């Protein structure tokens, strides 16, 4: 009747937190906590997964911040993985990560807020800038999805090779367009490169609006980030302890619901000589995907169809005098502006209009017999 939960966490302290969360789950079949810390490389990490965790027949594996080897290895058996802090969109692809859930939303879902922000400010014409990798394309697809769930359109989408230090061409491609609202998706160092080029290209002054995610206002990307930028931060997004607590509550709930059913088999123990999936794996997964915990430390924890956390709340943050200032929150479906006033990147404090129509419109025509003589 003993159901093992596993975890790969940052420190022994967080291990003790996991242990105490599990103990509490027992307090509130009996669970036993089994955990390890991250290995130095992916092969050692996979092997650690097998020898230390799967060897104890874990029904599920909590993973904090490269969860990839753990997802692959556990997914080999269809043992579910709960990401505590990873936000990369690649883990949302059922094809690659078959049994992966996470208590945080992927970066790309920030697009929803961007969309709500466009509603919050009637921006009907926008330029999208994404990095030409998985996360960028995910964000593009997701925003085009939001735009073509309601006739809304992208004036242009620009993509850049990650690691490119001169992006002047792309931004010059964006100068020629009408739309003055600019949305960005990029890593830290790329956010830095775009912000730099942009400024050198004088696109950070009056008339321009810059709307971004979390990576584009984090660490070094902040050092060169223009002022008046609007960005997002996932609330509680970095408290590993809270997410361990909630993940453990959800997993315990799911375990008990699973064991409320019949014909439950145990998971595989050792790796050696076992090549069949955990038969109850997909059902346990179904249980997690459809688990509901109302009184969570990080708010209301539910998962969507990709196993991504739904109904996440974001702080809407504004850079004012090189200081990060909270101008609002994103709840579940609605934007809430607080008493602190937004200072935009540009002149005055009035909300700009991203629809500056050019005086020179390049008209195109074709040589037709009765209408257009050439």
């Amino acid at each position: 009747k003993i159901v093992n939960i596993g975890a790969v966490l940052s420190t022994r302290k967080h291990e003790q937190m996991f242990r105490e969360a599990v103990n509490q789950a027992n307090k509130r079949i009996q669970l036993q906590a089994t955990s390890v810390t991250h290995k130095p490389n992916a092969i050692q990490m996979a092997l650690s997964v097998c020898e230390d965790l799967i060897s104890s027949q874990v029904y599920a594996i909590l993973v904090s911040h490269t969860p990839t080897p753990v997802s692959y290895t556990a997914g080999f058996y269809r043992i579910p993985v709960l990401g505590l802090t990873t936000r990369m969109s690649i883990y949302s692809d059922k094809s690659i990560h078959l049994s992966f859930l996470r208590t945080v939303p992927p970066y790309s879902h920030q697009s929803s807020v961007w969309f709500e922000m466009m509603r919050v400010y009637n921006w009907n014409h926008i330029i999208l800038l994404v990095s030409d990798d998985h996360e960028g394309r995910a964000a593009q697809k997701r925003l085009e999805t939001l735009l073509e769930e309601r006739e809304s359109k992208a004036e242009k989408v620009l993509q850049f090779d990650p690691g490119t230090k001169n992006v002047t061409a792309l931004l010059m491609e964006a100068r020629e367009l009408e739309a003055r609202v600019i949305i960005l998706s990029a890593s830290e160092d790329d956010a830095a490169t775009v912000y730099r080029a942009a400024a050198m290209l004088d696109m950070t002054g009056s008339g321009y609006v810059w709307l971004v995610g979390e990576r584009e206002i984090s660490g070094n990307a902040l050092r060169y980030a223009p002022d008046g930028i609007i960005g997002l931060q996932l609330i509680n997004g970095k408290n590993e302890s809270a997410h361990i607590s909630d993940a453990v509550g959800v997993v315990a709930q799911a375990v008990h619901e699973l064991l409320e059913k019949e014909n439950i088999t145990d998971p595989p123990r050792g790796c050696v000589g076992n090549t069949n999936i955990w038969k109850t794996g997909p059902l346990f997964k179904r249980v997690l995907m459809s688990s509901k915990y109302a009184d969570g430390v990080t708010g209301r924890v539910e998962f969507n169809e990709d196993g991504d956390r739904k109904f996440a709340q974001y702080s809407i943050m504004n850079l004012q005098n090189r200081k990060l200032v909270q101008v609002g929150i994103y709840n579940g479906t609605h934007v809430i502006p607080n008493d602190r006033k937004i200072i935009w990147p540009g002149g005055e404090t009035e909300k700009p209009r991203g629809y500056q129509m050019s005086t020179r419109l390049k008209i195109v025509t074709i040589h037709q017999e009765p209408f257009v003589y050439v």
Binding site: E176, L177, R360, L361, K362, I363, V364, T365, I366
Partner: protein, 49 residues
């Protein structure tokens, strides 16, 4: 052309008239690889900016 002059008269805007890079009007066609829907013609220039 005269219609464009009329539009320029009603709504004041400078215009730079040009012909299509090809000889067609505007029809959607498949790409050379990865199967991507791309318009060719006047719309192919309108969508590309």
């Amino acid at each position: 052309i005269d219609l464009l002059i009329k539009l320029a008269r009603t709504m004041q805007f400078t215009y730079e008239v040009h012909l299509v890079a090809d000889g067609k009007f505007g029809t959607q066609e498949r790409v050379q690889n990865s199967n991507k829907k791309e318009w060719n013609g006047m719309m192919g220039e309108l969508l590309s900016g």
